[PDB]
Design a protein around this nucleic acid. Structure first.
Ligand code: MN
Ligand code: MN
Ligand code: MN
Ligand code: MN
Ligand code: MN
Ligand code: MN
Ligand code: MN
Ligand code: MN
Ligand code: MN
Ligand code: NA
Length: 325
DNA sequence: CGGCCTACG
DNA sequence: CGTAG
DNA sequence: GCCG
């Protein structure tokens, strides 16, 4: 088992859901308490279990696995022996965990904001709504549309959204393209949002595109919230006789950067953090959604495909459906 | 000991 | 700070 | 929390 998540395939369907979900609770709780390092270890340990070929049945099967130490091993041991882990159950039932989960799921609210509200005694969405001057415009939109945004986005929604985005993009710039990214490109059947990457084959023609696309969508009445090259939107998606709010991310990249943007925006989140860590720590190259930089030569790697990027980092290529770390 | 991804809005 | 994967 |  390789130590970095970008070194191993991780399929969407795997064999250790119970164990990985428990470790991910502890990771989320670590985040709520402000420990990104513990969050990362628990995330990495959960991800190792997703890459295994079979269910873990006995603690022996963990020996030698990366990111399993005393704490993560004890969690698995309790789950294997007893079906539950006392620490996980205590976290699950705590008012702090439940409220932090409730607040951070709001679009516009992260851990630091949620933690302040918790310390101020707030506990419910109705508490937040009763104090609206304490909200940014982004948070007001997230709260306004919270019910819809909690409803899974389905493939039929993706297809309808891709059609309307393609229509606006084509009106704004002939020849521009729209690529579905995010979890749906990795094969997920559902999601919390839909992610799209927009480019044009002639370098530079995409300058100024995203404001033109947004203007065209807003004039068709499709935009409930927005506000460049990244737009984190809420769309008014038509449904039979009605509509529902859906989170949509729109990203524009020049074609020179498209493989890097496609790689970054396809995820998973852990896969990309691990890939960027690997690049810098193991290869001495700096990776982001714009490029891959050699800081000694002060040059950027020219990539035509995601495969090119994997090759330049010395990694076996993984298709999107194996990046579900 | 000290790192832990790296951007844009 | 929030967002993103 | 784990590891370089
Ligand atoms: Mn399998
Ligand atoms: Mn411990
Ligand atoms: Mn026991
Ligand atoms: Mn997404
Ligand atoms: Mn998104
Ligand atoms: Mn840019
Ligand atoms: Mn330390
Ligand atoms: Mn994400
Ligand atoms: Mn520690
Ligand atoms: Na949030």
């Amino acid at each position: 088992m390789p130590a970095y998540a970008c070194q191993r395939p991780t399929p969407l369907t795997h064999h250790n859901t119970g164990l990985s979900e428990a470790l991910e609770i502890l990771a989320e709780a670590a985040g709520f308490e402000g420990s990104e390092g513990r969050l990362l270890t628990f995330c990495r340990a959960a991800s190792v279990l997703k890459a295994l070929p079979s269910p873990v049945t006995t603690l022996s099967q963990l020996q030698g696995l990366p990111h399993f130490g005393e704490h993560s091993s004890r969690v698995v041991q309790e789950l294997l022996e007893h079906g539950v882990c006392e620490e996980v159950e205590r976290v699950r039932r705590s008012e702090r965990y439940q409220t932090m989960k409730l607040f951070t799921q709001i679009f516009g609210v992260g851990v630091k904001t949620a933690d302040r509200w918790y310390r101020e005694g707030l506990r419910t969405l109705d508490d937040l709504r009763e104090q609206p001057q304490k909200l940014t415009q982004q948070q007001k939109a997230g709260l306004q549309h919270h019910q819809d945004l909690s409803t899974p986005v389905l493939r039929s929604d993706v297809d309808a959204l891709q059609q309307v985005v393609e229509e606006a993009v084509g009106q704004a710039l002939p020849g521009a393209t729209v690529t579905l990214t995010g979890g749906f490109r990795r094969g997920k059947l559902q999601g919390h949002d839909v992610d799209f990457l927009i480019t044009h084959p002639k370098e530079g023609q995409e300058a100024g595109l995203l404001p033109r696309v947004m203007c065209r969508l807003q004039d068709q009445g499709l935009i409930l919230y927005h506000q460049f090259e990244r737009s984190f939107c809420i769309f008014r998606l038509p449904q039979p006789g009605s509509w529902k709010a859906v989170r949509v991310d729109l990203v524009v990249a020049p074609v020179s950067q498209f493989p890097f943007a496609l790689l970054g925006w396809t995820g998973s989140k852990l896969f990309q953090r691990e890939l960027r860590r690997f690049s810098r720590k193991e290869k001495g190259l700096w990776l982001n959604s714009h490029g891959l930089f050699d800081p000694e030569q002060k040059t950027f790697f020219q990539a035509a495909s995601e495969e090119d990027i994997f090759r330049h980092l010395g990694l076996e290529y993984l298709p999107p459906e194996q990046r579900n770390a």
